[PDB]
Amino acid sequence: QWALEDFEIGRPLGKGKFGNVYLAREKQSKFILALKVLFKAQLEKAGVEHQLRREVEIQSHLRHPNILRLYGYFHDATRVYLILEYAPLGTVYRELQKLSKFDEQRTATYITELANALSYCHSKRVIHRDIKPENLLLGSAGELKIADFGWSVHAPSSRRGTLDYLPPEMIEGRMHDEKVDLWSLGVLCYEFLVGKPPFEANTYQETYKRISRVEFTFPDFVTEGARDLISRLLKHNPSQRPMLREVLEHPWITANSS
Ligand SMILES: Nc1ncnc2c1ncn2[C@@H]1O[C@H](COP(=O)(O)OP(=O)(O)O)[C@@H](O)[C@H]1O
Ligand SMILES: Cc1c(C(=O)NS(=O)(=O)N(C)C)cc(-c2ccc(Cl)cc2)c2cc[nH]c12
Ligand SMILES: O=C(O)[C@@H]1CCCC[C@H]1C(=O)O
Numbered sequence: 001q002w003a004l005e006d007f008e009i010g011r012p013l014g015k016g017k018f019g020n021v022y023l024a025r026e027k028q029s030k031f032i033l034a035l036k037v038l039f040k041a042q043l044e045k046a047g048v049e050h051q052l053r054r055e056v057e058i059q060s061h062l063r064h065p066n067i068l069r070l071y072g073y074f075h076d077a078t079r080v081y082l083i084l085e086y087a088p089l090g091t092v093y094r095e096l097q098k099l100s101k102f103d104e105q106r107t108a109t110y111i112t113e114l115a116n117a118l119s120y121c122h123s124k125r126v127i128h129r130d131i132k133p134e135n136l137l138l139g140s141a142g143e144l145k146i147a148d149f150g151w152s153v154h155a156p157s158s159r160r161g162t163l164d165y166l167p168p169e170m171i172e173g174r175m176h177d178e179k180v181d182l183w184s185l186g187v188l189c190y191e192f193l194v195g196k197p198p199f200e201a202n203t204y205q206e207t208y209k210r211i212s213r214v215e216f217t218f219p220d221f222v223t224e225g226a227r228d229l230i231s232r233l234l235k236h237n238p239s240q241r242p243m244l245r246e247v248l249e250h251p252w253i254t255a256n257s258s
């Protein structure tokens, strides 16, 4: 179908674990898009060549306004190219870095957008497993778009950057389901309000212990309603975390969204 010759390449949009993401334009249609470029040698060396097929198969079949589109893929002798929807306002990561913290209204609107995209995903037993600011993209209207389905799988799974967003069950290497994304949502809510993730540390070692123990504290400015929602999402036991319907009906969400 597609080949590299069909696109004009622009500036890089960001650094990837196995290559780079570039702005690109489809020559015939003038369609601006993001081209996720991955080196075959690097994928092979890490043994993630089939998981890349998983990212493609899962993302390509999701249709939701808060989920980044994957249009297709193609590959040559040395690279794999993923054809993605271009998110013109960039990452939530960069917005957080420039704004420091988000107010309750911005946070709760993003949580609602995430819960709606996640509800959709989980309805197909799809687990994202890599929900984090650098993977949360922004559309033309500033709407949140879940991206980077790189580590995505169908639930239940026991399949093997920082640990900041990963729940205890995945950090230990145990069986896990859709509840992993509910923990990550909790870590995101805290980060949006506070400016840093709740288990952030200098080392992977210190962060591992913090997640395992559920060792976190809130700054005094965090409201009672925000503490309630976060504390509920951050349960060591996946069974005890709420459904996404419950997150969406939380009084703090309904009062501050959208
Ligand atoms: N569709 C896109 N539009 C705009 N920027 C993007 C897009 N996809 C990725 N990026 C940028 O490139 C980075 C790497 O993309 P990503 O899919 O997350 O790769 P990886 O799996 O290596 O982390 C993102 O964190 C973001 O900064
Ligand atoms: C060598 C190779 C192929 C492949 O079949 N290539 S080819 O023999 O047709 N040849 C041109 C070299 C295909 C892939 C691949 C993996 C995932 C996707 Cl979504 C698409 C392609 C990868 C990933 C790492 N090495 C790869
Ligand atoms: O698209 C990718 O860069 C990779 C494909 C293979 C699994 C890991 C994944 C990633 O880092 O998101």
Ligand SMILES: [Mg+2]
Residues within 6 Å of the ligand: 134, 135, 148
């Ligand atoms: Mg990423």
Ligand SMILES: [Mg+2]
Residues within 6 Å of the ligand: 017, 130, 148, 149, 150, 151
């Ligand atoms: Mg990824």
